Design a protein around this ligand. Structure first.
Ligand SMILES: O=C(Nc1nncn1C1CC1)[C@@H]1CCOc2ccc(Cl)cc21
Ligand SMILES: O=C(Nc1nncn1C1CC1)[C@@H]1CCOc2ccc(Cl)cc21
Lengths: 304, 304
């Protein structure tokens, strides 16, 4: 028993991290097969960032300007191209440590592990969720750009995020591995509105099920609710509206604990209306929304 | 910016994980050089666990009874010995993926990453602290025994914990890599008292400094306190008494933010006496004690 904010083991990703330097800018790249992926802003100086013309800036660069280093060994760049906000540096050597991998665009509300890196070196790993507003609340300092988010299914690493920037509000923004930003963000030093964020209701319900499985049941009550009534409360408390698709995804956890989804919804409604009253659920004094129903099942059945 | 409960990258540890089977029991082992380390209770059946005579149980085992598997390849056991609560299985092959490593006995209140494993396969990684009462609050299911806790300093992995058991209270207990239990625990299925636990005061102060560095300052106030006065409040709220050694370890964070340690102590005293009042600090609605002052400095300066 026990339930923790668990990251995927990062080994397969560590073997893909490289350092990319262009001019005076150094950040991280992801080396898969014979391509290194990195944020295109590696080609900007600090002054270029107000409003960079990336197509023009990239035209002044040649393959020999992109210094790619994997640990201590230097990679030979034989091509470069910009795809949305990422650069693809073709190298003459396929990464011998390339795992089975896929590039995926995750949905808001889904979770992933981030391997935070500096100068191509892994610093740490943490699990987070993509907020409904397409930002992530990470831990990223200058030089962390190019760090990636991923999930693993057996031996296949699905890369879903590459880190690009910190908005003036301290929240984080990045792209899929085809360089498409999640959300409305652009890779320029300008104030940018992140939309209204909401709490990921299906994740909070999943975590309440994780709580019951792991011994915490104080919040269970004698009530039930309906999707309509629960969504009125979800509206008031800035929670994502619950749908039958969300209810279906909670099916396995509802079957495992014997607590109907709408009965768990009534517990959540009471917690929203009354708070925790100085109590905790799985070491938390707030309603946790960074575990999907899949994460709860995977953690509770010990999937390797 | 941003502050997360970050684990060390687990790659170097993943390469050391093996599956050890003895009879009908399977758990994890740590393969370093030509030795595999695992909990001695791999030699018990479920019935042996009430009160096992480990010396007698081990006498009925030969090297050929310990099945050690690294991924798909089988290791040849050429020796076995019990050291406290761990077995050391000498194998004929040194692990080619053995990193630079040390075995260390951590102090209560220190933190470490756990790589949770099942059948020799890594499932996830999370950071936790050794409680003042020598238990850990992990996420461990049947078969997770043998999973290890560690810290990394550049390229050296200091292994500090090997998981042995879950107490009837749902908390976790384990040993150092020489098989000495942390705390009063014994590897037998019997009810065992974990001592009175306390909150790790120096860690909460470190995390309050991490909060200030990362933009959260609502809790800062116009007051100060003394070690004596703060310790009266620490006593009442079951916090570890603060010493000048703790104050010295917070020196770097006090110098970085310009907030004297006793002034941060007055903020903590007000938070203890009045609560958060429905507010949060770094995404938490309670006072976090799983970040040491070293973790805060390391996270805030991007150490790889
Ligand atoms: O955000 C950036 N780096 C970053 N990403 N996570 C953390 N950090 C550092 C600032 C704390 C760079 C520097 C600031 O100016 C910009 C502007 C646009 C872009 Cl794409 C990147 C950047
Ligand atoms: O605790 C144990 N395994 C374990 N450790 N973390 C999680 N879990 C499973 C139970 C949930 C085993 C089985 C229970 O009985 C015992 C008794 C003594 C010893 Cl050393 C190990 C064990």
């Amino acid at each position: 028993s026990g339930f923790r904010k668990m990251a995927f083991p990062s080994g397969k990703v560590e073997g893909c991290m490289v350092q990319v330097t262009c001019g005076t800018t150094t950040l991280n790249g992801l080396w898969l097969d014979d391509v290194v992926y990195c944020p295109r802003h590696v080609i900007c100086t600090s002054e270029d960032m107000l409003n960079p013309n990336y197509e023009d800036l990239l035209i002044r660069k040649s393959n020999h300007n992109f210094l790619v280093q994997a640990g201590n060994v230097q990679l030979r760049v034989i091509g470069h191209s910009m795809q949305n906000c990422v650069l693809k540096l073709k190298v003459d050597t396929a990464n011998p440590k390339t795992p089975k991998y896929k590039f995926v665009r995750i949905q808001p509300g889904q979770t992933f592990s981030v391997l935070a890196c500096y100068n191509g070196s892994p610093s740490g790993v943490y699990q987070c969720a993509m907020r409904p507003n397409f930002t992530i609340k990470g831990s990223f300092l200058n030089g962390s750009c190019g760090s990636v988010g991923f999930n693993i299914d057996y031996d296949c690493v699905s890369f879903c995020y590459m880190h690009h920037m910190e908005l003036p509000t301290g929240v984080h923004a990045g792209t899929d591995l085809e360089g498409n930003f999640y959300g409305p963000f652009v890779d320029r030093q300008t104030a940018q509105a992140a939309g209204t964020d909401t709490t990921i209701t299906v994740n909070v319900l999943a975590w309440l099920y994780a709580a019951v499985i792991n011994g915490d049941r104080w919040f269970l009550n004698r009530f039930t609710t309906t999707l309509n009534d629960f969504n009125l409360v979800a509206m008031k408390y800035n929670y994502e509206p619950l749908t039958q698709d969300h209810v279906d995804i909670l099916g396995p956890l509802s079957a495992q604990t014997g607590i109907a989804v709408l009965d768990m919804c009534a517990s959540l409604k009471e917690l929203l209306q009354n708070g925790m009253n100085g109590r905790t659920i799985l070491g938390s004094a707030l309603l946790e929304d960074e575990f999907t129903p899949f994460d709860v099942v995977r953690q509770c059945s010990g999937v390797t």
